[PDB]
Amino acid sequence: MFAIVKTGGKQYRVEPGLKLRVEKLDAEPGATVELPVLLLGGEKTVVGTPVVEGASVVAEVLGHGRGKKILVSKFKAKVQYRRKKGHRQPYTELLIKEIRG
Amino acid sequence: AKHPVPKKKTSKARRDARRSHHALTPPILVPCPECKAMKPPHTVCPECGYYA
Amino acid sequence: MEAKAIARYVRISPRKVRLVVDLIRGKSLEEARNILRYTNKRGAYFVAKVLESAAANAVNNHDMLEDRLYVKAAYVDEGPALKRVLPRARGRADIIKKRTSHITVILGEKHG
Amino acid sequence: KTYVPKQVEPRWVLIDAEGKTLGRLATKIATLLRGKHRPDWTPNVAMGDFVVVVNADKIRVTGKKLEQKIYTRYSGYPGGLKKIPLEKMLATHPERVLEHAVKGMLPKGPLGRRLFKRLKVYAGPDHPHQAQRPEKL
Amino acid sequence: PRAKTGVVRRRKHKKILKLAKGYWGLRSKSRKARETLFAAGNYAYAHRKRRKRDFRRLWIVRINAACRQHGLNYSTFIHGLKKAGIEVDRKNLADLAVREPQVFAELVERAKAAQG
RNA sequence: GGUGAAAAGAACCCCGGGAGGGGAGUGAAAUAGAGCCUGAAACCGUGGGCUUACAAGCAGUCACGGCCCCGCAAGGGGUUGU
RNA sequence: UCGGGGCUUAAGCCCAGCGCCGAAGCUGCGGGUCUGGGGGAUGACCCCAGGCGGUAGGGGAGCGUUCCCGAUGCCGAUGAAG
Ligand SMILES: [Mg+2]
Ligand SMILES: [Mg+2]
Ligand SMILES: [Mg+2]
Ligand SMILES: [Mg+2]
Ligand SMILES: [Mg+2]
Ligand SMILES: [Mg+2]
Ligand SMILES: [Mg+2]
Ligand SMILES: [Mg+2]
Ligand SMILES: [Mg+2]
Ligand SMILES: [Mg+2]
Ligand SMILES: [Mg+2]
Ligand SMILES: [Mg+2]
Ligand SMILES: [Mg+2]
Ligand SMILES: [Mg+2]
Ligand SMILES: [Mg+2]
Ligand SMILES: [Mg+2]
Ligand SMILES: [Mg+2]
Ligand SMILES: [Mg+2]
Ligand SMILES: [Mg+2]
Ligand SMILES: [Mg+2]
Ligand SMILES: [Mg+2]
Ligand SMILES: [Mg+2]
Ligand SMILES: [Mg+2]
Ligand SMILES: [Mg+2]
Ligand SMILES: [Mg+2]
Ligand SMILES: [Mg+2]
Ligand SMILES: [Mg+2]
Ligand SMILES: [Mg+2]
Ligand SMILES: [Mg+2]
Ligand SMILES: [Mg+2]
Ligand SMILES: [Mg+2]
Ligand SMILES: [Mg+2]
Ligand SMILES: [Mg+2]
Ligand SMILES: [Mg+2]
Ligand SMILES: [Mg+2]
Ligand SMILES: [Mg+2]
Ligand SMILES: [Mg+2]
Ligand SMILES: [Mg+2]
Ligand SMILES: [Mg+2]
Ligand SMILES: [Mg+2]
Ligand SMILES: [Mg+2]
Ligand SMILES: [Mg+2]
Ligand SMILES: [Mg+2]
Ligand SMILES: [Mg+2]
Ligand SMILES: [Mg+2]
Ligand SMILES: [Mg+2]
Ligand SMILES: [Mg+2]
Ligand SMILES: [Mg+2]
Ligand SMILES: [Mg+2]
Ligand SMILES: [Mg+2]
Ligand SMILES: [Mg+2]
Ligand SMILES: [Mg+2]
Ligand SMILES: [Mg+2]
Ligand SMILES: [Mg+2]
Ligand SMILES: [Mg+2]
Ligand SMILES: [Mg+2]
Ligand SMILES: [Mg+2]
Ligand SMILES: [Mg+2]
């Protein structure tokens, strides 16, 4: 059931329950959260308005956690200037449960 | 020291490369009538002798 | 099983002997003996001599059979160099490198 | 993650050339040459359709072009700038005129050349009667 | 109290030279690596911003190549949606063109009618 | 400048003219074997994995794919085709 | 050789229009740091708004090396430094 859902500024399709990783959220460790945001479905849930009206995808916040430490580093030539800076983004482990439109 | 002079240290890669055809080639030998010994073609040989 | 043999401190240039060794690498013992015999190079004599002892060790210390061994692997290594002066025109003095080698040869039982 | 394509059978095509304006034709030929028309597009892999053209000599061209248009062949030697007008091309090998137009509109890279192979051109018609031949306009 | 250079410098070096492993020639065997890493760092940070524009266009082509098959400009298509008031098709997920064509098709029809 | 706690400094056999090795033997340890503690880097070499003979390059970076490698998978490592 | 291909009721020039592409700008979601305001009697921590290209320079806060007190201590062959 290809149901889209925008969360964390970005939106993605959602299968009938599956492991997914999304932007950080203010949910309990292993609780449940509903994303009223939903677009389309398995049988052509045309999204009239920007977002489908009565409908919702729910998922269990499997857990939080930071990720790979990407390394940003600036440098300008002929001019003593260099900046080493590490940065690792946070992300919640949204395990999809219910996909009821 | 004079006019012609290497402009850059030749990389180890480009170096080894030039030494491509540098490799040796094994001698050519054949069994003799006398001993089973290996003689180079068109030759006599010690510890074997010859005829005519 | 394998039988080593090493010639340390051989007054001869590595690049030079590498050529000879490269000839015999992974060859039947009797095959090699012949190559070194008629191969035209100074490096032969040294490699042959160490190759030859490599066999003796294979036999008199490792129960191996002469009629069944080969060159599992072999290689020369660069040892210390003898630096020497060299009078050059107009006073310039150049240091010449009489290099040295560490010939290694290792034999092995063929198959079964 | 965006779709990751897999091996696909080469879709051949048969194209006419009578009355077709040189360039306007070359554009489409190019666009079809790379799989840039099919929505399963991927620059990386290169999987454009095998375009085959016929009736090259038939190609139209506006204004003073048969007489004006000049082609440059530079050899490594001095004064080797040898230049040939359009009329002469159609006299000798006319297929060239369409080739040197398509080739120019393909990308510059290694696969761009791999694409120039997908393009077959003759004037007759009568291609090598292989198999596919889905005509088009 | 004299303070030798000691270990300090050697660690700082191999520390960097480890990062620089996998490069070409001296470039991965010395202080050349540093220069190389400088360039790399700046490349990544720029190719990070690029990676966005990369897929922006990657998708666009796909979408356009798809609705052009139904018979319209990508420009025409999008205008219909912007009018229809459907932010839904984020250009990324317009990849429906390959997954569930039919859904894309009905999205097309929506834009057709949405226009006029 | 520096073997080791001690010279216990390697008898005897084997290859070799010798040098040097291979066994044996001492030692906790012998890649502690004698300009011998530790033993880094440049630099030379042997074996293995990925790779390269239509290709244009400050040598990297971003992406996808292929091959090999750790894990059951999800993942990660190495390599580089476009 | 107009960047090239190539373009002629144009892929050129003028006039009117709609749409789309397009930057590290602006928005969205997440995270730093600092400054300001609040909760909080409070220290504390949380929330809200804003600032954060940079050479010569000025300012602030750290990290590591050697050595001394802490040592008649503590770790250390079940392995110190490197
Ligand atoms: Mg509800
Ligand atoms: Mg980790
Ligand atoms: Mg610069
Ligand atoms: Mg040079
Ligand atoms: Mg090499
Ligand atoms: Mg080599
Ligand atoms: Mg004769
Ligand atoms: Mg006789
Ligand atoms: Mg060499
Ligand atoms: Mg013997
Ligand atoms: Mg002289
Ligand atoms: Mg010199
Ligand atoms: Mg006809
Ligand atoms: Mg001229
Ligand atoms: Mg002239
Ligand atoms: Mg054909
Ligand atoms: Mg046919
Ligand atoms: Mg110093
Ligand atoms: Mg975009
Ligand atoms: Mg001692
Ligand atoms: Mg002594
Ligand atoms: Mg003593
Ligand atoms: Mg000795
Ligand atoms: Mg022993
Ligand atoms: Mg021992
Ligand atoms: Mg020993
Ligand atoms: Mg070692
Ligand atoms: Mg030791
Ligand atoms: Mg020894
Ligand atoms: Mg000695
Ligand atoms: Mg000691
Ligand atoms: Mg060296
Ligand atoms: Mg050398
Ligand atoms: Mg190349
Ligand atoms: Mg298991
Ligand atoms: Mg992981
Ligand atoms: Mg132009
Ligand atoms: Mg211009
Ligand atoms: Mg105007
Ligand atoms: Mg007006
Ligand atoms: Mg206007
Ligand atoms: Mg206008
Ligand atoms: Mg309008
Ligand atoms: Mg409008
Ligand atoms: Mg308007
Ligand atoms: Mg407009
Ligand atoms: Mg900004
Ligand atoms: Mg405050
Ligand atoms: Mg409180
Ligand atoms: Mg107080
Ligand atoms: Mg802020
Ligand atoms: Mg001191
Ligand atoms: Mg003291
Ligand atoms: Mg002990
Ligand atoms: Mg230990
Ligand atoms: Mg230990
Ligand atoms: Mg110390
Ligand atoms: Mg310390």
What brief labels describe this structure?
part of a larger assembly; 5 chains; B: 52 residues; little secondary structure; two-stranded antiparallel ribbon; 13% helix; E: 116 residues; mainly alpha; 66% helix; rod-shaped; binds magnesium ion; RNA-binding; ribosome; 70S; IGR; ires; psiv
* Overall geometric form of chain B: rod-shaped
Largest beta sheet of chain C, briefly?
3 strands, antiparallel
What is the rounded distance between the termini of chain C?
13 Å
Count helical runs of chain B.
1
Helix/strand-derived category of chain C reads: alpha+beta
Tally of helical segments of chain C: 3
**Biggest sheet of chain B, in brief?**
2 strands, antiparallel
Alpha carbon gap, first and last residue of chain B? 60 Å
Radius of gyration of chain B: 23 Å
Task: Find the biggest chain interface.
Answer: A-E, 22 and 21 residues
The string of secondary-structure elements of chain C, in order, is EHHHEE
Strand arrangement within the widest β-sheet of chain B reads 1-2
Any chance you could write out the topology, listing elements then pairs?
This is part of a larger assembly, with chains A (101 residues), B (52 residues), C (112 residues), D (137 residues) and E (116 residues).
Chain A: E1 3-7, E2 10-14, E3 32-35, E4 57-61, E5 70-75, E6 82-87, E7 94-96
Antiparallel strand pairs in A: 1-2, 3-4, 4-7, 5-6
Chain B: H1 12-18, E1 30-31, E2 38-39
Antiparallel strand pairs in B: 1-2
Chain D: E1 12-15, H1 22-33, E2 50-53, E3 70-72, E4 83-85, H2 86-91, H3 95-105, H4 110-118, E5 120-121, E6 135-136
Parallel strand pairs in D: 1-2, 1-6, 2-5
Antiparallel strand pairs in D: 3-4
Helix pairs in contact in D: 1-3
The structure holds magnesium ion (MG) (58 copies).
One magnesium ion (MG) binds at residues 7-8, 10 of chain B.
Chain E binds 2 RNA strands through residues 1-8, 10-14, 17, 22-27, 29-30, 35-37, 39-58, 60, 73-79, 82.
PDB class: ribosome
Keywords: 70S, ribosome, IGR, ires, psiv, CrPV
Entry title: Crystal structure of a complex containing domain 3 from the PSIV IGR IRES RNA bound to the 70S ribosome.
Short description:
This is part of a larger assembly, with chains A (101 residues), B (52 residues), C (112 residues), D (137 residues) and E (116 residues). With 101 residues, chain A is mostly beta strands.
